[PDB]
C-alpha cells in the first residue's frame, strides 16, 4: 500500500491550486507533500499522506468527484513512489514538513 496518490484533474474549467488540493485531501489524513505539474496536456499532481490508509480512503471517497460545480473532476490512482522529494515551496510544490525550503532556484 502506497501513501502517494497520482491525481489528474479533468475538465479544468476553473483554476485548481495546490492549496485547494491540500484542503480537500486533508479531510482524510495528514498531507505531507504535494507537487503539481502538466503532462499529456492535463493538470496532474502527486500527493503524499503519512498513512497509506489515508491514501486508500481518499481514493475511495474522492475518485470521480468534482472539486467545484460542473468541473474539475478528480481521477485518482496509487503511485508506486514510496515518498516524494520536494525542492521548493511555491505555487507548484510544497513540503508541509519543511518550511525552510526556498521558493525557487
Amino acid at each position: 500500500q502506497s501513501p502517494v496518490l497520482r491525481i489528474i484533474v479533468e475538465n479544468l474549467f476553473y483554476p485548481v491550486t495546490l492549496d485547494v488540493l491540500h484542503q480537500i485531501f486533508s479531510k482524510f489524513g495528514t498531507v505531507l507533500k504535494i507537487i503539481t505539474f502538466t503532462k499529456n496536456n492535463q493538470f496532474q499532481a502527486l500527493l503524499q499522506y503519512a498513512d497509506p490508509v489515508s491514501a486508500q480512503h481518499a481514493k475511495l471517497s474522492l475518485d470521480g468527484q468534482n472539486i467545484y460545480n460542473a468541473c474539475c473532476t478528480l481521477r485518482i490512482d496509487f503511485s508506486k513512489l514510496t515518498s516524494l522529494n520536494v525542492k521548493y515551496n511555491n505555487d507548484k510544490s510544497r513540503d508541509y514538513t519543511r518550511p525552510d525550503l526556498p521558493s525557487g532556484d
Partner: peptide, 7 residues
C-alpha cells in the same frame, strides 16, 4: 456533477 467546494 455537484462539487466538493463552492464558487
Amino acid at each position: 456533477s455537484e462539487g466538493l467546494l463552492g464558487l
